[PDB]
Ligand SMILES: *SCCCCC(=O)NO
């Protein structure tokens with residue numbers, strides 16, 4: 066009943082297996098960073114992300130060329146061992162909170178099985194891994210060994226509250242949109258959270274409200290992991306497929322468009338802004354991509370590496386993509402099974418559904434306005450638990466989401482910056 070079987074301490078000695086110094090592949094040149102394998106295929110790097118983007122290596126603000134008023138900078142955050150220890154325990158606690166629900170158990174299972182496809186070969190007859198879906202692990206003897214992985218949680222770059230999904234691209238293949246998948250780096254912090262307003266009219270108005278209620282960071286992480294699920298299955302929607310927000314006078318007075326991928330990931334009523342014709346266009350597109358993967362696996366007659374047999378890897382991708390196998394070992398895609406897997410990843414795994422499972426208060430739509438950012442500490446169980454988040458059972462915080470009420474539960478939240486009015 067435990068997703069993370071070891072309670073890591075940041076200062077635990079390296080062992081070259083699940084506590085190790087690692088380099089992420091072909092990223093110019095970097096110094097190895099201490100990393101922690103918290104589950105099969107999932108690693109945590111308690112560092113500010115100065116690696117995945119060469120354009121983002123400085124931790125203090127740009128020349129405000131692209132200064133979003135919804136932003137927060139602190140060059141010193143996550144620079145000390147105590148902070149990295151607390152980041153690691155916070156992230157592991159949120160994974161346990163997610164895994165404690167049926168929906169999060171299902172989502173994390175999909176993610177672990179969502180191994181990025183072995184589509185690196187130039188010969189149709191051979192199956193080969195794609196380099197950028199691995200990390201390099203320093204072994205006890207000081208040499209590097211390459212390890213495939215699906216997901217890395219890393220600390221944010223310069224902008225602390227811009228949680229972004231980063232994955233390494235291909236020269237020709239669009240790995241997050243062609244059914245293949247790729248290793249996903251999520252910038253994320255458990256040490257901050259956002260305020261929202263409990264009345265829809267106030268929450269969706271840019272001039273009103275200070276952010277009375279705090280978002281549960283388990284919801285925020287689950288939201289990022291939903292994107293990671295889409296991207297690991299290669300079914301993310303192109304970010305320039307957008308909704309011209311015509312349902313909010315403030316959104317449209319500015320030129321505000323919101324990606325279909327975000328509306329999908331929130332779910333509930335937001336996903337209805339993706340119209341039936343284009344939704345079907347997407348499902349057919351991804352259905353064809355899975356067939357191309359079935360064609361590639363059929364055409365494969367050799368393996369590369371000594372890490373697995375050919376039809377071991379064939380069975381790995383038969384299980385990931387839920388392919389049918391005929392009496393001749395030829396793979397095909399069954400529409401019923403495809404529609405079911407696609408729907409699980411896109412309609413069942415949503416922010417709105419996670420809200421139901423956690424029984425928290427949350428924004429009612431993605432089409433709102435940020436209110437505030439708070440400093441928090443979820444590591445102590447007197448503050449936050451796996452089973453209750455902030456709304457601790459058998460206290461004054463159990464009822465009416467009083468734990469998320471930053472006015473009632475004020476010692477758990479320090480307001481760092483207001484956003485209302487800045488729009
Ligand atoms: S997967 C990260 C993409 C941008 C962050 C986000 O999900 N915002 O809702």
Ligand SMILES: [Zn+2]
Nearest residue numbers: 288292327330
């Ligand atoms: Zn999102």
